Amino acid sequence: SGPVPSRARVYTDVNTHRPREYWDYESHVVEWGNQDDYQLVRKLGRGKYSEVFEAINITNNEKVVVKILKPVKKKKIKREIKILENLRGGPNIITLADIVKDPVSRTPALVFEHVNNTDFKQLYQTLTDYDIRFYMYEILKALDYCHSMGIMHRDVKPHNVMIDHEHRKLRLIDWGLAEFYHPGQEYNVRVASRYFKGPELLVDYQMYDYSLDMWSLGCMLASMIFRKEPFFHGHDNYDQLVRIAKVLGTEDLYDYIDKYNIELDPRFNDILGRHSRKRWERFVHSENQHLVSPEALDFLDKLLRYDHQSRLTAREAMEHPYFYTVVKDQA
Numbered sequence: 001s002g003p004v005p006s007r008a009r010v011y012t013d014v015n016t017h018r019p020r021e022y023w024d025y026e027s028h029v030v031e032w033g034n035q036d037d038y039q040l041v042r043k044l045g046r047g048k049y050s051e052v053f054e055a056i057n058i059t060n061n062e063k064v065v066v067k068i069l070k071p072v073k074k075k076k077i078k079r080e081i082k083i084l085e086n087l088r089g090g091p092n093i094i095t096l097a098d099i100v101k102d103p104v105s106r107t108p109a110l111v112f113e114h115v116n117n118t119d120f121k122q123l124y125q126t127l128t129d130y131d132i133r134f135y136m137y138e139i140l141k142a143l144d145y146c147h148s149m150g151i152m153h154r155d156v157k158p159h160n161v162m163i164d165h166e167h168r169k170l171r172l173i174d175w176g177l178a179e180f181y182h183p184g185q186e187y188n189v190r191v192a193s194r195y196f197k198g199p200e201l202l203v204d205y206q207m208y209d210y211s212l213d214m215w216s217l218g219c220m221l222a223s224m225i226f227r228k229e230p231f232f233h234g235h236d237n238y239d240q241l242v243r244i245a246k247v248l249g250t251e252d253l254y255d256y257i258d259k260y261n262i263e264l265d266p267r268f269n270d271i272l273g274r275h276s277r278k279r280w281e282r283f284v285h286s287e288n289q290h291l292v293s294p295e296a297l298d299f300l301d302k303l304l305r306y307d308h309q310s311r312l313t314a315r316e317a318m319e320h321p322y323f324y325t326v327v328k329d330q331a
Protein backbone atom coordinates (compact mmCIF):
# COMPACT_ATOMS: atom_id res chain seq x y z
CA SER A 1 0.00 0.00 0.00
CA GLY A 2 1.07 3.60 -0.78
CA PRO A 3 2.00 6.37 1.70
CA VAL A 4 -0.60 8.36 3.71
CA PRO A 5 -1.04 11.87 2.12
CA SER A 6 -0.05 15.02 4.05
CA ARG A 7 -0.97 18.72 3.89
CA ALA A 8 0.79 21.78 5.29
CA ARG A 9 -0.59 22.67 8.77
CA VAL A 10 -0.44 26.42 7.82
CA TYR A 11 -0.62 28.52 4.57
CA THR A 12 -2.11 25.39 2.91
CA ASP A 13 -4.14 27.03 0.09
CA VAL A 14 -2.42 30.41 -0.36
CA ASN A 15 -1.36 29.54 -4.00
CA THR A 16 -4.82 28.13 -4.92
CA HIS A 17 -6.29 31.55 -3.84
CA ARG A 18 -3.82 33.38 -6.10
CA PRO A 19 -4.16 33.92 -9.92
CA ARG A 20 -2.44 31.01 -11.87
CA GLU A 21 0.39 33.48 -12.99
CA TYR A 22 1.68 33.86 -9.40
CA TRP A 23 2.91 30.21 -9.26
CA ASP A 24 2.67 28.92 -12.89
CA TYR A 25 6.35 29.76 -13.57
CA GLU A 26 6.55 27.63 -16.80
CA SER A 27 4.47 30.34 -18.50
CA HIS A 28 6.56 33.20 -16.94
CA VAL A 29 8.26 35.49 -19.51
CA VAL A 30 11.66 36.78 -18.31
CA GLU A 31 12.19 40.62 -18.30
CA TRP A 32 15.78 41.33 -19.52
CA GLY A 33 17.94 44.31 -18.54
CA ASN A 34 21.10 45.63 -20.25
CA GLN A 35 24.21 43.49 -19.76
CA ASP A 36 26.42 46.63 -20.54
CA ASP A 37 25.22 48.24 -17.28
CA TYR A 38 27.47 45.79 -15.39
CA GLN A 39 31.24 45.39 -15.28
CA LEU A 40 32.61 42.39 -13.39
CA VAL A 41 35.13 43.28 -10.64
CA ARG A 42 36.21 39.84 -9.28
CA LYS A 43 35.10 36.25 -8.61
CA LEU A 44 33.40 35.47 -5.29
CA GLY A 45 32.89 31.72 -5.73
CA ARG A 46 30.90 28.94 -7.41
CA GLY A 47 27.77 26.79 -7.01
CA LYS A 48 26.29 23.64 -8.56
CA TYR A 49 24.61 25.66 -11.34
CA SER A 50 26.65 28.95 -11.31
CA GLU A 51 29.80 31.20 -11.07
CA VAL A 52 29.28 34.30 -8.89
CA PHE A 53 31.11 37.61 -9.19
CA GLU A 54 31.17 41.04 -7.61
CA ALA A 55 30.30 43.69 -10.21
CA ILE A 56 29.74 47.40 -10.59
CA ASN A 57 26.54 48.85 -12.07
CA ILE A 58 28.18 51.61 -14.19
CA THR A 59 24.86 53.66 -14.41
CA ASN A 60 24.58 54.30 -10.61
CA ASN A 61 28.09 53.19 -9.32
CA GLU A 62 26.44 50.57 -7.05
CA LYS A 63 28.16 47.31 -6.02
CA VAL A 64 26.13 44.20 -7.05
CA VAL A 65 26.54 40.39 -6.97
CA VAL A 66 26.26 38.64 -10.39
CA LYS A 67 25.28 34.94 -10.53
CA ILE A 68 26.10 33.67 -14.06
CA LEU A 69 24.23 30.39 -14.64
CA LYS A 70 25.65 27.09 -15.93
CA PRO A 71 23.20 25.17 -18.28
CA VAL A 72 19.95 24.77 -16.28
CA LYS A 73 16.42 23.94 -17.52
CA LYS A 74 14.60 27.12 -18.61
CA LYS A 75 11.61 26.27 -16.33
CA LYS A 76 14.00 26.11 -13.25
CA ILE A 77 15.44 29.58 -14.19
CA LYS A 78 11.85 30.90 -14.55
CA ARG A 79 11.00 29.35 -11.15
CA GLU A 80 13.91 31.09 -9.28
CA ILE A 81 13.14 34.44 -11.06
CA LYS A 82 9.39 34.13 -10.29
CA ILE A 83 10.02 33.25 -6.63
CA LEU A 84 12.51 36.21 -6.30
CA GLU A 85 10.07 38.66 -7.93
CA ASN A 86 7.21 37.36 -5.70
CA LEU A 87 9.31 37.77 -2.49
CA ARG A 88 10.83 41.16 -3.42
CA GLY A 89 10.60 43.64 -0.53
CA GLY A 90 9.93 40.82 1.97
CA PRO A 91 11.82 40.95 5.33
CA ASN A 92 15.45 39.72 5.04
CA ILE A 93 14.84 38.33 1.50
CA ILE A 94 17.75 38.99 -0.93
CA THR A 95 16.71 41.53 -3.62
CA LEU A 96 16.95 40.48 -7.27
CA ALA A 97 17.97 43.80 -8.97
CA ASP A 98 18.23 42.64 -12.62
CA ILE A 99 18.39 39.77 -15.13
CA VAL A 100 20.80 39.97 -18.08
CA LYS A 101 21.95 37.56 -20.83
CA ASP A 102 25.78 36.95 -20.55
CA PRO A 103 27.55 37.45 -23.98
CA VAL A 104 30.32 34.80 -23.56
CA SER A 105 28.16 32.10 -21.87
CA ARG A 106 24.86 33.16 -23.67
CA THR A 107 23.27 32.10 -20.32
CA PRO A 108 21.28 34.28 -17.90
CA ALA A 109 23.10 36.15 -15.16
CA LEU A 110 21.02 37.13 -12.11
CA VAL A 111 22.00 40.47 -10.54
CA PHE A 112 21.53 40.78 -6.75
CA GLU A 113 21.82 43.37 -4.00
CA HIS A 114 25.34 43.10 -2.45
CA VAL A 115 25.69 41.98 1.21
CA ASN A 116 29.04 42.72 2.97
CA ASN A 117 29.21 39.20 4.46
CA THR A 118 31.38 38.25 7.45
CA ASP A 119 32.40 34.60 6.54
CA PHE A 120 30.43 32.09 8.74
CA LYS A 121 33.63 30.04 9.56
CA GLN A 122 34.96 33.26 11.31
CA LEU A 123 31.68 35.01 12.40
CA TYR A 124 30.11 32.04 14.28
CA GLN A 125 33.15 31.71 16.66
CA THR A 126 32.48 35.37 17.80
CA LEU A 127 28.63 35.29 18.20
CA THR A 128 27.20 35.72 21.73
CA ASP A 129 23.99 34.08 23.09
CA TYR A 130 22.04 37.28 22.15
CA ASP A 131 23.50 37.34 18.55
CA ILE A 132 22.31 33.73 17.85
CA ARG A 133 18.77 34.56 19.14
CA PHE A 134 18.82 37.84 17.14
CA TYR A 135 19.90 36.28 13.85
CA MET A 136 17.63 33.22 14.36
CA TYR A 137 14.67 35.65 14.77
CA GLU A 138 15.77 37.47 11.53
CA ILE A 139 15.89 34.11 9.58
CA LEU A 140 12.36 33.33 10.97
CA LYS A 141 11.05 36.67 9.56
CA ALA A 142 12.25 35.56 6.06
CA LEU A 143 10.83 32.00 6.50
CA ASP A 144 7.44 33.10 7.85
CA TYR A 145 7.26 35.57 4.97
CA CYS A 146 8.20 33.10 2.16
CA HIS A 147 5.88 30.38 3.67
CA SER A 148 2.99 32.95 3.94
CA MET A 149 3.73 33.65 0.25
CA GLY A 150 3.36 29.89 -0.58
CA ILE A 151 7.08 29.20 -1.06
CA MET A 152 9.43 26.59 0.55
CA HIS A 153 13.18 27.62 0.37
CA ARG A 154 14.37 23.92 0.55
CA ASP A 155 18.05 24.89 0.90
CA VAL A 156 18.32 26.62 4.33
CA LYS A 157 21.96 26.29 5.56
CA PRO A 158 24.68 28.74 6.93
CA HIS A 159 26.12 29.39 3.41
CA ASN A 160 22.65 30.69 2.27
CA VAL A 161 22.45 33.20 5.14
CA MET A 162 24.49 36.38 4.42
CA ILE A 163 25.23 38.41 7.53
CA ASP A 164 26.63 41.98 7.58
CA HIS A 165 27.40 41.82 11.38
CA GLU A 166 28.60 45.49 11.63
CA HIS A 167 25.13 46.60 10.35
CA ARG A 168 23.26 43.57 11.97
CA LYS A 169 21.83 42.89 8.48
CA LEU A 170 20.76 39.41 7.40
CA ARG A 171 19.59 38.17 3.94
CA LEU A 172 18.38 34.68 3.05
CA ILE A 173 19.87 34.00 -0.39
CA ASP A 174 19.99 31.43 -3.22
CA TRP A 175 16.37 30.64 -4.03
CA GLY A 176 17.55 28.27 -6.82
CA LEU A 177 16.00 25.21 -5.07
CA ALA A 178 12.84 27.03 -3.82
CA GLU A 179 9.36 25.75 -4.87
CA PHE A 180 5.71 26.81 -4.61
CA TYR A 181 3.74 24.71 -2.11
CA HIS A 182 0.63 23.00 -3.56
CA PRO A 183 -1.50 20.61 -1.39
CA GLY A 184 -1.14 17.04 -2.69
CA GLN A 185 2.00 17.77 -4.77
CA GLU A 186 4.86 15.25 -4.61
CA TYR A 187 8.23 17.00 -4.66
CA ASN A 188 11.74 15.88 -5.59
CA VAL A 189 13.46 14.60 -2.38
CA ARG A 190 16.97 15.21 -3.96
CA VAL A 191 17.13 18.77 -2.55
CA ALA A 192 19.27 20.48 0.21
CA SER A 193 22.82 19.80 1.38
CA ARG A 194 23.36 16.39 3.07
CA TYR A 195 23.67 17.78 6.63
CA PHE A 196 20.46 19.87 6.44
CA LYS A 197 18.21 17.24 4.77
CA GLY A 198 14.96 16.55 6.67
CA PRO A 199 14.03 12.92 7.61
CA GLU A 200 11.15 13.19 4.97
CA LEU A 201 13.87 13.57 2.24
CA LEU A 202 15.98 10.70 3.65
CA VAL A 203 13.00 8.26 3.78
CA ASP A 204 11.72 9.41 0.32
CA TYR A 205 8.42 10.94 1.60
CA GLN A 206 7.53 13.26 -1.32
CA MET A 207 4.40 15.07 -0.01
CA TYR A 208 6.38 17.49 2.15
CA ASP A 209 5.86 21.24 2.79
CA TYR A 210 7.23 24.45 4.44
CA SER A 211 8.07 22.35 7.58
CA LEU A 212 11.15 20.99 5.71
CA ASP A 213 12.78 24.47 6.18
CA MET A 214 12.12 24.20 9.94
CA TRP A 215 14.24 21.00 10.19
CA SER A 216 17.08 22.82 8.29
CA LEU A 217 16.79 25.75 10.73
CA GLY A 218 17.02 23.34 13.71
CA CYS A 219 20.27 21.85 12.26
CA MET A 220 21.69 25.42 11.99
CA LEU A 221 20.60 26.27 15.59
CA ALA A 222 22.13 23.00 16.94
CA SER A 223 25.45 23.74 15.09
CA MET A 224 25.53 27.33 16.49
CA ILE A 225 24.66 26.72 20.20
CA PHE A 226 26.80 23.53 20.49
CA ARG A 227 29.65 24.87 18.25
CA LYS A 228 29.44 21.52 16.34
CA GLU A 229 29.52 21.93 12.55
CA PRO A 230 27.84 19.96 11.06
CA PHE A 231 25.55 18.80 13.88
CA PHE A 232 24.34 15.60 12.02
CA HIS A 233 27.50 14.43 10.21
CA GLY A 234 26.45 11.67 7.76
CA HIS A 235 28.88 9.91 5.38
CA ASP A 236 26.08 9.70 2.73
CA ASN A 237 22.23 10.10 2.60
CA TYR A 238 21.64 6.67 4.28
CA ASP A 239 24.20 7.35 7.09
CA GLN A 240 22.69 10.86 7.44
CA LEU A 241 19.43 9.28 8.81
CA VAL A 242 21.58 6.98 11.08
CA ARG A 243 23.28 10.17 12.57
CA ILE A 244 19.78 11.63 13.25
CA ALA A 245 18.51 8.31 14.76
CA LYS A 246 21.50 8.16 17.18
CA VAL A 247 20.24 11.51 18.65
CA LEU A 248 16.41 11.44 18.16
CA GLY A 249 16.16 7.68 18.75
CA THR A 250 14.89 4.90 16.45
CA GLU A 251 11.47 4.52 18.24
CA ASP A 252 10.09 7.93 17.10
CA LEU A 253 11.57 7.23 13.61
CA TYR A 254 9.69 3.88 13.26
CA ASP A 255 6.54 5.60 14.67
CA TYR A 256 6.92 8.29 11.96
CA ILE A 257 7.45 5.55 9.25
CA ASP A 258 4.32 3.70 10.52
CA LYS A 259 2.13 6.88 10.74
CA TYR A 260 2.72 7.77 7.03
CA ASN A 261 2.89 4.12 5.80
CA ILE A 262 6.37 4.86 4.36
CA GLU A 263 8.11 1.87 2.74
CA LEU A 264 11.73 2.05 3.97
CA ASP A 265 14.55 1.37 1.46
CA PRO A 266 15.81 -2.22 2.38
CA ARG A 267 19.39 -0.77 2.79
CA PHE A 268 18.16 1.13 5.90
CA ASN A 269 17.10 -2.08 7.78
CA ASP A 270 20.66 -3.26 8.57
CA ILE A 271 22.17 0.20 9.32
CA LEU A 272 19.52 2.05 11.42
CA GLY A 273 19.80 -0.36 14.35
CA ARG A 274 18.28 0.51 17.74
CA HIS A 275 19.09 3.78 19.48
CA SER A 276 17.63 5.62 22.46
CA ARG A 277 16.67 9.31 22.25
CA LYS A 278 19.54 11.31 23.73
CA ARG A 279 19.39 14.31 26.08
CA TRP A 280 20.75 17.61 24.64
CA GLU A 281 23.12 17.84 27.68
CA ARG A 282 25.63 15.36 26.16
CA PHE A 283 26.55 18.02 23.52
CA VAL A 284 27.11 20.73 26.21
CA HIS A 285 30.70 21.42 27.32
CA SER A 286 32.82 24.26 28.82
CA GLU A 287 33.38 25.88 25.36
CA ASN A 288 29.64 26.14 24.35
CA GLN A 289 27.68 26.36 27.71
CA HIS A 290 27.42 30.22 27.45
CA LEU A 291 25.25 29.73 24.28
CA VAL A 292 23.08 26.90 25.73
CA SER A 293 20.13 27.64 28.04
CA PRO A 294 16.89 25.70 28.90
CA GLU A 295 15.04 28.05 26.40
CA ALA A 296 17.49 27.15 23.56
CA LEU A 297 17.04 23.38 24.22
CA ASP A 298 13.23 23.55 24.46
CA PHE A 299 13.11 25.53 21.15
CA LEU A 300 15.64 23.13 19.46
CA ASP A 301 13.64 20.01 20.52
CA LYS A 302 10.45 21.53 19.00
CA LEU A 303 12.18 22.01 15.61
CA LEU A 304 13.96 18.65 15.30
CA ARG A 305 11.02 16.23 14.99
CA TYR A 306 10.87 13.33 12.46
CA ASP A 307 7.18 14.09 11.93
CA HIS A 308 7.13 17.30 9.82
CA GLN A 309 3.51 18.02 11.00
CA SER A 310 4.69 18.25 14.65
CA ARG A 311 7.57 20.79 14.06
CA LEU A 312 6.96 24.47 15.00
CA THR A 313 5.89 26.76 12.14
CA ALA A 314 8.11 29.85 11.62
CA ARG A 315 5.33 31.97 13.31
CA GLU A 316 5.06 29.61 16.37
CA ALA A 317 8.91 29.59 16.55
CA MET A 318 8.91 33.46 16.76
CA GLU A 319 6.58 33.25 19.86
CA HIS A 320 8.99 30.93 21.75
CA PRO A 321 10.51 32.20 25.13
CA TYR A 322 14.03 31.90 23.54
CA PHE A 323 13.21 35.19 21.65
CA TYR A 324 11.49 37.19 24.51
CA THR A 325 14.42 39.71 24.93
CA VAL A 326 14.96 40.06 21.12
CA VAL A 327 11.16 40.75 20.65
CA LYS A 328 11.15 43.26 23.65
CA ASP A 329 14.31 45.05 22.27
CA GLN A 330 12.69 45.30 18.80
CA ALA A 331 9.69 47.16 20.40
Ligand SMILES: CC(=O)Nc1cc(Nc2cc(NC3CC3)n3nccc3n2)ccc1C
Nearest residue numbers: 045046047052065067114115116117173174
Ligand atom coordinates in the same frame (compact mmCIF):
# COMPACT_ATOMS: atom_id res chain seq x y z
C1 LIG B 1 23.63 34.34 -6.00
C2 LIG B 1 23.63 33.15 -5.09
O1 LIG B 1 22.80 33.01 -4.21
N1 LIG B 1 24.66 32.29 -5.28
C3 LIG B 1 25.83 32.15 -4.51
C4 LIG B 1 26.34 33.28 -3.87
C5 LIG B 1 27.62 33.26 -3.32
N2 LIG B 1 28.16 34.39 -2.66
C6 LIG B 1 27.70 35.67 -2.32
C7 LIG B 1 28.55 36.62 -1.71
C8 LIG B 1 28.06 37.85 -1.29
N3 LIG B 1 28.81 38.85 -0.64
C9 LIG B 1 30.27 38.80 -0.51
C10 LIG B 1 30.90 39.53 0.62
C11 LIG B 1 30.85 38.05 0.62
N4 LIG B 1 26.73 38.08 -1.52
N5 LIG B 1 26.05 39.23 -1.21
C12 LIG B 1 24.80 38.98 -1.61
C13 LIG B 1 24.65 37.71 -2.16
C14 LIG B 1 25.91 37.14 -2.13
N6 LIG B 1 26.40 35.92 -2.54
C15 LIG B 1 28.41 32.12 -3.47
C16 LIG B 1 27.91 31.02 -4.14
C17 LIG B 1 26.63 31.01 -4.70
C18 LIG B 1 26.13 29.80 -5.46
